[PDB]
C-alpha cells in the first residue's frame, strides 16, 4: 500500500 509520508505534499484523497 502507499506510504502517505513518502511525500507529505501529496494528498491521496484530494
Amino acid at each position, epitope marked *: 500500500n502507499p506510504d502517505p*509520508n*513518502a*511525500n*507529505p505534499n*501529496v*494528498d491521496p484523497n484530494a
Partner: antibody
Amino acid sequence: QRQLVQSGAEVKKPGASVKVSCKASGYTFTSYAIHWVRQAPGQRLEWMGWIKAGNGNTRYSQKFQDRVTITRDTSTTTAYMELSSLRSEDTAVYYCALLTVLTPDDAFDIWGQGTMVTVSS
Amino acid sequence: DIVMTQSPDSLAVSLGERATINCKSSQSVFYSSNNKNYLAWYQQKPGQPPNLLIYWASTRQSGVPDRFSGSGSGTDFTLTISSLQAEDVASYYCHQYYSSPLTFGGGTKVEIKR
C-alpha cells in the same frame, strides 16, 4: 510566481561539510515540505530527504541518514541541507524542490535552480 | 526501493512525428482503494531543473501543451508526445511517490532528426 532560489556553487575538501541554502518566496512557506534531490554525473536523480517547513520534522533517505541534516528558518522562509564527511560520490548538482504538491486546492511543482558541489582538495 | 526502468534510453524522430517513452516500476504503484497510480513524468533540459509534465500517471499539469499525455496503470506506464516539436528535445523521467524513498527513472533522451 512561486520560486526557490539556491546558494551558489562551492568546492569543499574530502571529509569536510557543505551547507546549501534554499530561499522560498511567493507561497505559504509553512504549508509544504521541501525536498532535497541530487543529480550526480551519469546517475539518476536521487532523493535525499524532506523537511516540513512548518513543524520542521524531517525524513531522510537511508543512503544519507548518518550524514545529512535538513533544517529550516521560518523567519527567513529558507531551508538548508548540510552534508558531512564528503566523498568523491558527492560531487553533484543539489536541488531543493516542492515535489508534487497535489492538494484539494492546488497542484504545482517547483524546483530551485541547482547548486553544484565539487568535492576536491 | 521501487526501481523505475525506462525504455528506450534514447530516441530520435522527425519534427511532427509521434514519440513514445515507456516506464516500468518494479512494484505496482496502483492503489485499488482509490484507483490511483502514484506516478509522475518530468522533462529536463541541460543546465535546468526538471519540469513536471504529468502526475497521477495521466493528469496533465496546467500549462503543459496537450501533445503530452500519460497512460498506464500498475507497473507499465507510457509518456506520449503526439507531435514532436523542436522545443521538446530534452530528457524525460518517470517518478514514483508511492513509497519511500522517492525514486526516478534513468531517463529517455529525445532527439530531433532534421
